[PDB]
Amino acid sequence: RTPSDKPVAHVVANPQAEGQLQWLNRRANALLANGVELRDNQLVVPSEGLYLIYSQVLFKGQGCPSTHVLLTHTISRIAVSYQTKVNLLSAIKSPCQRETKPWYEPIYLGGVFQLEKGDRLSAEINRPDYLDFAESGQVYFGIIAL
Amino acid sequence: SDKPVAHVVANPQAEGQLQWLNRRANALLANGVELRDNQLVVPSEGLYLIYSQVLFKGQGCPSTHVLLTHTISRIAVSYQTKVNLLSAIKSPCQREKPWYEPIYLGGVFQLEKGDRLSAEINRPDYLDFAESGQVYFGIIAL
Amino acid sequence: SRTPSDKPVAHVVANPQAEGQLQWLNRRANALLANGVELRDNQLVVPSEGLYLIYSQVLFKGQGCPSTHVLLTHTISRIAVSYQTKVNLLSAIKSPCQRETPEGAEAKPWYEPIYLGGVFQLEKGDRLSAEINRPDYLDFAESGQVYFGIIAL
């Protein structure tokens, strides 16, 4: 019947953005609906409430170097009333333990959070050079109002 | 309540395949969602949260490099056109003791009436068939 | 304003002040309890029967390897009103150190995140715990690294 009025977003990484994790909505199977905006690479919350927040990144390397590789993926919240950047969800992986075959490290982050109107959300990594885009659906960021 | 929903689980008896079931312990199909040809069929257009999880298990590492994939695809109504919505890859063996590798996926998508969704893996021989609350596939109309 | 969700939900985080322990908090920025979920004696209390996604992440960190004898575990358990003893729902074990650090070599910091997640039929009054064996290896300095939650489907 009547379509959903729930604020939602599902944005995907730009495979040809050099040295960055750039989010896009103008792609097949990506979206912004019911007031969610994508501004300065951040998802902007249109109304207060409970939201599921999620992101996936996929890292890939060919063997292990001598300099220690640390991979991080973090979802942050910038609340309009506080004007502060706070981690909501974060993970750190060390793909190489003993040093030198291609390795793969997916990092999926998800949770339920109380958000405020105007909050800004970012999903970031430290190593965009290790991102893999072999297939579609491997690198994404989204929110769903409950 | 009237929202199309599904939560299907893997068959622990289906040899070398990832077979989804709605006739099991904590599974369901409601408000028009169907399970046909191992694919969830969308009864109406709208926003859906689509999710899944698979578990892989191996005893040690072989000489051949093992890559584990899990993918959720969308097959647009009428056409056979298959497109990845969500996908991940894991390499359990680095240097070639039992290991465990979960892969979980989830996101919100605009779907059309009659779209078919599949949740597939490349290695059903590595599937951890144990009837835990952990190999599943589901959708929820928002 | 839109009608609030009536779904029981929780997202609790580790107390970063409680070093050497895994203490869950709802009384912390960006942590919540809603629609009847309680946090009592470090456990999540289920307010109503149904399907729930239960999830948790812990992050372990060490500087080098003391030997290959470090075992890291994370477990989610259920205490049902009908069977008031812990049953494991989800569990994982990790050995961060494979070869042990040779004397004087760079003690490269290792990281081991463990995610536990699944969908379970729960009953009213179920108590859920998310526990680790090594709180001394837990890295909860920065926010968002260590959490435990439930979402009624």
Ligand SMILES: C[C@@H](Nc1c(Cl)cnc2ccc(-c3cnc(C(C)(C)O)nc3)cc12)c1ccccc1F
């Ligand atoms: C985004 C999410 N995705 C999932 C994944 Cl990657 C895996 N399994 C799931 C199982 C069930 C559901 C789910 C979540 N929410 C519902 C509602 C209340 C909208 O009806 N219905 C099913 C979502 C997920 C996620 C992941 C991790 C931590 C919290 C989450 F919300």
